[PDB]
Design a protein around this motif. Structure first.
Motif, PDB file in Angstrom:
ATOM      1  N   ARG A   1       0.822  -1.201   0.000  1.00 37.75           N
ATOM      2  CA  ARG A   1       0.000   0.000   0.000  1.00 37.75           C
ATOM      3  C   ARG A   1       0.863   1.260   0.000  1.00 37.75           C
ATOM      4  O   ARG A   1       0.547   2.260  -0.632  1.00 37.75           O
ATOM      5  CB  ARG A   1      -0.883  -0.028   1.248  1.00 37.75           C
ATOM      6  CG  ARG A   1      -2.349   0.272   0.931  1.00 37.75           C
ATOM      7  CD  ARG A   1      -3.268  -0.026   2.120  1.00 37.75           C
ATOM      8  NE  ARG A   1      -3.527   1.193   2.891  1.00 37.75           N
ATOM      9  CZ  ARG A   1      -2.712   1.450   3.932  1.00 37.75           C
ATOM     10  NH1 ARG A   1      -1.721   0.624   4.219  1.00 37.75           N
ATOM     11  NH2 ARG A   1      -2.910   2.546   4.671  1.00 37.75           N
ATOM     12  N   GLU A   2       1.958   1.192   0.779  1.00 41.74           N
ATOM     13  CA  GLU A   2       2.866   2.330   0.852  1.00 41.74           C
ATOM     14  C   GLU A   2       3.562   2.578  -0.489  1.00 41.74           C
ATOM     15  O   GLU A   2       3.681   3.698  -0.966  1.00 41.74           O
ATOM     16  CB  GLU A   2       3.910   2.033   1.930  1.00 41.74           C
ATOM     17  CG  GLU A   2       3.405   2.346   3.340  1.00 41.74           C
ATOM     18  CD  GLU A   2       4.439   1.909   4.351  1.00 41.74           C
ATOM     19  OE1 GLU A   2       5.504   2.509   4.398  1.00 41.74           O
ATOM     20  OE2 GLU A   2       4.171   0.962   5.088  1.00 41.74           O
ATOM     21  N   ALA A   3       4.063   1.477  -1.080  1.00 42.71           N
ATOM     22  CA  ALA A   3       4.774   1.597  -2.348  1.00 42.71           C
ATOM     23  C   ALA A   3       3.886   2.180  -3.450  1.00 42.71           C
ATOM     24  O   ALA A   3       4.238   3.127  -4.140  1.00 42.71           O
ATOM     25  CB  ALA A   3       5.266   0.207  -2.752  1.00 42.71           C
ATOM     26  N   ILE A   4       2.710   1.549  -3.633  1.00 49.45           N
ATOM     27  CA  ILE A   4       1.791   2.032  -4.658  1.00 49.45           C
ATOM     28  C   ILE A   4       1.517   3.529  -4.510  1.00 49.45           C
ATOM     29  O   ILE A   4       1.324   4.258  -5.474  1.00 49.45           O
ATOM     30  CB  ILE A   4       0.483   1.249  -4.532  1.00 49.45           C
ATOM     31  CG1 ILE A   4       0.560  -0.047  -5.342  1.00 49.45           C
ATOM     32  CG2 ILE A   4      -0.681   2.086  -5.093  1.00 49.45           C
ATOM     33  CD1 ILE A   4      -0.343  -1.142  -4.774  1.00 49.45           C
ATOM     34  N   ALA A   5       1.462   3.975  -3.241  1.00 43.27           N
ATOM     35  CA  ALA A   5       1.207   5.387  -2.985  1.00 43.27           C
ATOM     36  C   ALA A   5       2.431   6.248  -3.307  1.00 43.27           C
ATOM     37  O   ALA A   5       2.347   7.297  -3.931  1.00 43.27           O
ATOM     38  CB  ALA A   5       0.835   5.544  -1.509  1.00 43.27           C
ATOM     39  N   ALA A   6       3.596   5.785  -2.816  1.00 50.09           N
ATOM     40  CA  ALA A   6       4.828   6.524  -3.069  1.00 50.09           C
ATOM     41  C   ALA A   6       5.093   6.682  -4.567  1.00 50.09           C
ATOM     42  O   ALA A   6       5.684   7.650  -5.029  1.00 50.09           O
ATOM     43  CB  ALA A   6       5.982   5.765  -2.413  1.00 50.09           C
ATOM     44  N   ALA A   7       4.665   5.661  -5.332  1.00 52.38           N
ATOM     45  CA  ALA A   7       4.871   5.707  -6.773  1.00 52.38           C
ATOM     46  C   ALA A   7       3.823   6.581  -7.468  1.00 52.38           C
ATOM     47  O   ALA A   7       3.908   6.891  -8.648  1.00 52.38           O
ATOM     48  CB  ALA A   7       4.798   4.277  -7.311  1.00 52.38           C
ATOM     49  N   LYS A   8       2.787   6.953  -6.694  1.00 47.97           N
ATOM     50  CA  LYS A   8       1.701   7.728  -7.280  1.00 47.97           C
ATOM     51  C   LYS A   8       1.058   6.969  -8.443  1.00 47.97           C
ATOM     52  O   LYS A   8       0.571   7.536  -9.414  1.00 47.97           O
ATOM     53  CB  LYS A   8       2.281   9.053  -7.780  1.00 47.97           C
ATOM     54  CG  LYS A   8       2.839   9.910  -6.643  1.00 47.97           C
ATOM     55  CD  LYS A   8       2.984  11.380  -7.042  1.00 47.97           C
ATOM     56  CE  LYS A   8       2.570  12.338  -5.921  1.00 47.97           C
ATOM     57  NZ  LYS A   8       3.256  13.617  -6.088  1.00 47.97           N
ATOM     58  N   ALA A   9       1.101   5.627  -8.330  1.00 48.95           N
ATOM     59  CA  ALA A   9       0.623   4.780  -9.420  1.00 48.95           C
ATOM     60  C   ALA A   9      -0.908   4.763  -9.522  1.00 48.95           C
ATOM     61  O   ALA A   9      -1.632   4.849  -8.541  1.00 48.95           O
ATOM     62  CB  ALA A   9       1.134   3.361  -9.176  1.00 48.95           C
ATOM     63  N   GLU A  10      -1.394   4.682 -10.778  1.00 45.96           N
ATOM     64  CA  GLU A  10      -2.832   4.596 -11.000  1.00 45.96           C
ATOM     65  C   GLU A  10      -3.278   3.159 -11.276  1.00 45.96           C
ATOM     66  O   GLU A  10      -4.428   2.785 -11.089  1.00 45.96           O
ATOM     67  CB  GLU A  10      -3.185   5.484 -12.194  1.00 45.96           C
ATOM     68  CG  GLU A  10      -2.754   6.936 -11.992  1.00 45.96           C
ATOM     69  CD  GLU A  10      -2.879   7.681 -13.302  1.00 45.96           C
ATOM     70  OE1 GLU A  10      -1.936   7.663 -14.080  1.00 45.96           O
ATOM     71  OE2 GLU A  10      -3.930   8.277 -13.535  1.00 45.96           O
ATOM     72  N   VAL A  11      -2.327   2.347 -11.775  1.00 47.73           N
ATOM     73  CA  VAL A  11      -2.711   0.997 -12.166  1.00 47.73           C
ATOM     74  C   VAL A  11      -1.761  -0.043 -11.572  1.00 47.73           C
ATOM     75  O   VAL A  11      -0.552   0.134 -11.517  1.00 47.73           O
ATOM     76  CB  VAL A  11      -2.676   0.916 -13.692  1.00 47.73           C
ATOM     77  CG1 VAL A  11      -2.746  -0.544 -14.136  1.00 47.73           C
ATOM     78  CG2 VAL A  11      -3.845   1.681 -14.287  1.00 47.73           C
ATOM     79  N   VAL A  12      -2.364  -1.138 -11.073  1.00 49.15           N
ATOM     80  CA  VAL A  12      -1.567  -2.244 -10.548  1.00 49.15           C
ATOM     81  C   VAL A  12      -2.099  -3.579 -11.068  1.00 49.15           C
ATOM     82  O   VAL A  12      -3.285  -3.870 -11.008  1.00 49.15           O
ATOM     83  CB  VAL A  12      -1.651  -2.213  -9.017  1.00 49.15           C
ATOM     84  CG1 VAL A  12      -0.816  -3.343  -8.417  1.00 49.15           C
ATOM     85  CG2 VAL A  12      -1.135  -0.884  -8.501  1.00 49.15           C
ATOM     86  N   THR A  13      -1.188  -4.385 -11.644  1.00 47.12           N
ATOM     87  CA  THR A  13      -1.626  -5.664 -12.188  1.00 47.12           C
ATOM     88  C   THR A  13      -1.762  -6.740 -11.113  1.00 47.12           C
ATOM     89  O   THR A  13      -1.043  -6.778 -10.119  1.00 47.12           O
ATOM     90  CB  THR A  13      -0.638  -6.108 -13.274  1.00 47.12           C
ATOM     91  OG1 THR A  13       0.660  -6.305 -12.703  1.00 47.12           O
ATOM     92  CG2 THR A  13      -0.547  -5.039 -14.366  1.00 47.12           C
ATOM     93  N   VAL A  14      -2.766  -7.611 -11.315  1.00 49.85           N
ATOM     94  CA  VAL A  14      -2.955  -8.726 -10.397  1.00 49.85           C
ATOM     95  C   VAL A  14      -3.222 -10.018 -11.161  1.00 49.85           C
ATOM     96  O   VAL A  14      -3.644 -10.022 -12.308  1.00 49.85           O
ATOM     97  CB  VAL A  14      -4.138  -8.409  -9.480  1.00 49.85           C
ATOM     98  CG1 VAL A  14      -3.704  -7.437  -8.388  1.00 49.85           C
ATOM     99  CG2 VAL A  14      -5.273  -7.798 -10.275  1.00 49.85           C
ATOM    100  N   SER A  15      -2.922 -11.137 -10.494  1.00 47.97           N
ATOM    101  CA  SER A  15      -3.094 -12.418 -11.150  1.00 47.97           C
ATOM    102  C   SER A  15      -4.431 -13.060 -10.802  1.00 47.97           C
ATOM    103  O   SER A  15      -5.184 -12.604  -9.948  1.00 47.97           O
ATOM    104  CB  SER A  15      -1.956 -13.332 -10.703  1.00 47.97           C
ATOM    105  OG  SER A  15      -0.953 -13.360 -11.717  1.00 47.97           O
TER     106      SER A  15
END
Lengths: 64, 233, 234, 64
Positions: C29-43
């Motif tokens: 959760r921290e990383a995704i936020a720090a990256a300011k990412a909008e999209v994350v892939t999941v399996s």
């Protein structure tokens, strides 16, 4: 014969101030090396130049 | 809290800029700000800039110097003109490739130090010479990435990696001369090196200001990657 | 601003993240936020917390684990109703030894997937020719890998990704995934004029994942501006 | 003999809900595939399993 900025000139007898004035360059923005000695534009010696006198008139410029 | 010290001077930005090549002065000031730089190098030469560089600490250099006698000479003139105690020592006998003379930079550094000068020595990727300079007292050490302005990037990486290996024993290590793209700076930072000195790559760009920021981000990113402990390939 | 589009989707960040190897959803959760990412892939895996630790971003379902197109279209269907999203990261890897994708299989899967109204984001080798075919099929992206997945070697596939950069205008957005181990890697890719990067092992495997996630962020931003700023010529 | 996530199990006669309950998974997080027909965990068919059914129970996990 006075070496000014590498070029030989007939400056013997004149003062650093007089020359710098003719050059038409402001004194505060430059430094003058008179014969290995470092002087600010505003603090150059009053002694007239003599044959053999090596003079450099430098400023800060952009570069490297 | 990630500050580094050049002697008694505490800087934050690891991205040190240079003044040359800027078409005019307006862009240059846009560049300097865009990068958020604090130290800018300037050169001393025989006869508007001071006004453009206001806000930043001037780092004088002995560019144009080919010997130790000429470099010390230029350093003296720079001291009276900037009002600062530190100086980039640059002794390039032949401007063709702009490579520094190891023996002449060593001679001039030893003279400037006992002359109250803070020596920031321009040098080739010589780790042995670097340890000499550090033992002399020079506040830093700056191996080039490649020939100056070539834009060749980190071509001395192999030997530069040795500087990083011996990080603890040297003054701050500043890579100057070689970097044409921001990623080059990121690479040098991720190695653990202290700072980066960029000139050509920014001024010679379509949009100097924009490229000054990219270099800002890049040097921040690389430094953080180093501190974040990268994965092992 | 400087935004791109995956089909009908307009993204601002050029840094897409992956949820592999995160030792917990907290540092994730921290990383995704720090990256300011909008999209994350999941399996999509077999059932032997995530969906809520990934709120705030969009979910990209991939068909990882699929060795064939048939298995790929299968995972995609389940991935679609599992996220409700229209797009999918097509992935067809027979030999997981290197994780290299199959040209023809991924091509066939892409065709069926787009006939099923899917937005395919094809994981692929650095095959420009195959990339051009994928583009004529109706792919919203093309995702040449930088190097063997999770390796972190770097941009070992540089020479070929340069061709992608040259035929930038004939291809859909070009996203580089699989191979990047430092942010300087991503910057390099972005300096070429590529559209975006996808990072996973590099951020998660790092000592301080959140910190590295930011680093990569700055690097994608740095590299992108460099390209738009017109680098000097060596 | 129904196939459950690739394993042969004596499921014939039971329902998806029944097995998923015994399984003990939350339905709103899993998706169910029954012989290539894809269902939401909360919408699984109330039909009793047949000898030969192929059941997959999947959820969104890590990867990318």
């Amino acid at each position: 014969m006075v070496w000014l900025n590498g070029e030989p000139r007939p400056l013997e007898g004149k003062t650093l101030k007089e020359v710098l004035e003719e050059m038409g360059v402001e004194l505060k923005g430059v430094a003058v090396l008179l014969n290995e000695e470092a002087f600010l534009g505003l603090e150059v010696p009053d002694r007239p130049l003599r044959d053999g006198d090596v003079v450099e008139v430098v400023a800060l410029m952009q570069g490297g | 809290m990630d500050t580094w010290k050049v002697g008694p001077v505490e800087l934050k930005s690891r991205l040190i800029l240079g003044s040359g090549k800027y078409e005019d002065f307006g862009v240059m000031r846009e560049a300097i700000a865009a990068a958020k730089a604090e130290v800018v190098t300037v050169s001393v030469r025989r006869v508007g800039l001071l006004e453009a560089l206001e806000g930043v600490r001037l780092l004088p250099n002995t560019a144009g110097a080919r010997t130790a006698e000429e470099a010390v000479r230029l350093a003296r003139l720079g001291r009276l003109l900037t009002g600062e105690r530190w100086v980039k020592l640059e002794v390039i006998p032949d401007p063709t490739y702009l490579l520094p003379d190891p023996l002449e930079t060593l001679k001039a550094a030893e003279r400037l130090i006992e002359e109250d000068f803070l020596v920031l020595p321009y040098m080739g990727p010589d780790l042995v010479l670097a340890k000499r300079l550090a033992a002399l007292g020079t506040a830093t050490v700056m191996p080039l990435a490649a020939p100056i302005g070539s834009g060749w990037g980190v071509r001395t990486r192999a030997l530069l990696e040795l500087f990083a290996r011996e990080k603890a024993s040297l003054p701050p290590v500043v890579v100057d001369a070689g970097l044409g793209l921001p990623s080059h700076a990121a690479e040098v930072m991720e190695l653990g090196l202290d700072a980066v000195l960029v000139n050509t790559a920014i001024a010679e760009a379509q949009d100097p200001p924009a490229m000054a920021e990219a270099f800002r981000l890049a040097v921040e990113a690389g430094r953080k990657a180093y501190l974040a402990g990268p994965m092992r390939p």
